[PDB]
UniProtKB/Swiss-Prot annotation:
Changing residue 55 to A: Reduces affinity for poly-U RNA ends. GO terms for biological process: mRNA splicing, via spliceosome; rRNA processing; tRNA processing. The keyword rRNA processing applies. It is found in: Nucleus; Cytoplasm. Its main location: nucleus. This is LSM2-LSM8 complex subunit LSM8. One of its GO terms (molecular function) is mRNA binding. The chain holds residues 3 to 67 of 109 of the full protein. Present with 1440 molecules/cell in log phase SD medium. Component of the heptameric LSM2-LSM8 complex that forms a seven-membered ring structure with a donut shape; an RNA strand can pass through the hole in the center of the ring structure. The LSm subunits are arranged in the order LSM8, LSM2, LSM3, LSM6, LSM5, LSM7 and LSM4. Component of the spliceosome U4/U6-U5 tri-snRNP complex composed of the U4, U6 and U5 snRNAs and at least PRP3, PRP4, PRP6, PRP8, PRP18, PRP31, PRP38, SNU13, SNU23, SNU66, SNU114, SPP381, SMB1, SMD1, SMD2, SMD3, SMX2, SMX3, LSM2, LSM3, LSM4, LSM5, LSM6, LSM7, LSM8, BRR2 and DIB1. Residues 1-65 form the Sm domain.
Length: 65
RNA sequence: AAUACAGAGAUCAGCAGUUCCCCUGCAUAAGGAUGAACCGUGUU
């Protein structure tokens, strides 16, 4: 199991608190720490960041859109 | 000895089996020939 096939692609991320993101996945490590670019709030469609680092503890789901 | 009789009394063919001999298989023994690019003491 690996997030390799998702690199540089757009993804949906569901956080553990049920919050939702849309972003380009650029980096990831073994603990699921993500490096993201052009992040948005799925529900809100509100631009969050041009670049952001997201802890794996926070992630519940990553989907390939 | 006399008599009564009954009174002159199977053939064609096939296959395997012993005996040597050649061809071809598998086995058991010994014998040889040659080929195979790789080297074991603090987040679930």
């Amino acid at each position: 199991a690996t997030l390799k096939d998702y690199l540089n692609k757009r993804v949906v991320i569901i956080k553990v608190d049920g919050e939702c993101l849309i972003a380009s996945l650029n980096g990831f490590d073994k603990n699921t720490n993500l490096f993201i670019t052009n992040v948005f709030n799925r529900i809100s469609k509100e631009f969050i960041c041009k670049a952001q680092l997201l802890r794996g503890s926070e992630i519940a789901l990553v989907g390939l859109i």
